[PDB]
């Protein structure tokens, strides 16, 4: 019934609806519309992998590489686990 607005995307959502949006340029979060008379939203990274090292957002199942602190290649995969978690092997 009540709506939340994304003025940057020109979109709107009803209470209880969830959508993805960028955050701080390169991150991604999942937002839910609460409403509460102010178009209030709650947004979370808990289902995403926002890796500061690579300044890239990954979805569950996405893979990427990066280095450790001694020149070794790490293979990373986004697992989520309700904790914005990922796992790398060195």
């Amino acid at each position: 019934a009540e709506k939340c607005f994304d003025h940057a995307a020109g979109t709107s959502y009803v209470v209880g609806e969830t959508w993805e949006k960028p955050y701080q340029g390169w991150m991604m979060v999942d937002c839910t519309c609460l409403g509460e008379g102010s178009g209030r939203i709650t947004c979370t990274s808990r289902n995403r992998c926002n890796d500061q090292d690579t300044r890239t957002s990954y979805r569950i199942g996405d893979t990427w590489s990066k280095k450790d602190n001694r020149g070794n290649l790490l293979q990373c995969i986004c697992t989520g686990n309700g904790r914005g978690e990922w796992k790398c092997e060195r």
């Binding site: 008379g37 102010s38 178009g39 939203i41 790490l74 990373c76 904790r83 914005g84 790398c88």
Partner: peptide, 19 residues
């Protein structure tokens, strides 16, 4: 040898979208 590296970046925020 090397075990798995576990990393996390978990956060939440709220914001109003009507003034």
């Amino acid at each position: 040898k090397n075990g798995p590296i576990i990393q996390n970046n978990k956060f939440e925020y709220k914001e109003d979208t009507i003034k």
